[model samples]
Target: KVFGRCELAAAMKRHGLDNYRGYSLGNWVCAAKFESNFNTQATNRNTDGSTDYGILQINSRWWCNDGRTPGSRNLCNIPCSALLSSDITASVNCAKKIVSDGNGMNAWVAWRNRCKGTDVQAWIRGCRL
Candidate 1:
């Protein structure tokens, strides 16, 4: 998969996390790889008709709803607004949530094969409370 490593790494760094190398990498990558295939412009089906856009799969409610170029997600994509709260962290944090949530990365680890490849399940399966 031609995942957007540059964009994903940029986002990860902003959140004080490394790209697939940080302590949180295993979990984050599991969700990120599955959520949007690592595409910064990733979007997906929403209950509403509009559109949920961005690398984190942001919905048409928080910021990037109008499909506006250089929109909120572009805050990081652009030089002027490169804010930490932009879509970059939004995506990373969201993926983080998915990975470390109640069930940890069980579903994602199994689904992405990173568990078998590198025992990523060790991280998820043993996430402490």
Candidate 2:
């Protein structure tokens, strides 16, 4: 499923990501935009054999259980499929684990290259948050 920009922004904030690990709601919104274009079922197979899942693009390598990546960690204790669901709670929690693991939002290339040091306020323009 796809989400409206403001709808996604509001949802992320409601999930407690507004100031998560020093990354603002706009930062998350920006990453989500570039990562999967707000599509819940989005998935990308990587060169390293890890698949990125959902709008936030949580990786199957270490964040979720994909049952295929030989180097998988499943640290979040969630099925990778869980991130692909319309309910983003699992994806958001996995993202939180990522930052707490010392990677911060930089773990997502979209956030580092596109969102970092950028004016992400535009991502939340009419979200009313």
Candidate 3:
């Protein structure tokens, strides 16, 4: 499912993305927009043969086991396909795990390049969280 801005925001907020790992809801929402444009089935193949999956683009190399990724750690203990589900709960949970790893949201390059240190209030301004 491709979610609209506020729709995605509500979903993220509902799943506890708000203030998760000291990253505000706006930070999560903004980064997700850059990472996947709210696409539930989004996938990106990394140069190292790893794949990024779902809205937050959780990577197969370290977070999920896609079987296709040569050296997957499966730290999240979830199938990479699970991230593609429209349910979104899996993606939110996995992203939280990723953030808690001490890298914060910088684990995703999109977040660091596009969202880090930016004013993302516009992403959630009218969402009415």
Task: Tell me the tens digit of each residue's lDDT in model 1 across 59-102.
Answer: 44333435443233432232222212335655555445444445
* Of 1 and 3, the candidate ranking higher by TM-score: 3
What digit string (tens of lDDT, one per residue) describes model 3 on residues 1-129? 999999999999899888887888889888889999989899999899998999999989899988887767999999999999989999888888999998888898988999888897778997766
lDDT of 2 by residue, 1-129 (tens): 899999999899899999898888999999999999999999999999999999999998888998999978999999999999998899998899998888788899988998899899989986676
Give the poorly placed runs of model 2, Cα more than 4 Å off.
none
Ranking by lDDT: 2, 3, 1
RMSD of each: 9.1, 0.9, 0.8
Model 2 clash tally? 0
Q: Candidate 3: how many backbone clashes?
A: 0
lDDT of 3: 0.89
RMSD from true fold, candidate 1 = 9.1
CA lDDT for candidate 2: 0.91
All candidates' TM-scores? 0.42, 0.96, 0.96
Evaluated against the true structure, the overall lDDT of model 1 is 0.46
Candidate 1 Cα misplacement greater than 4 A, ranges: 1-11, 18-23, 67-129
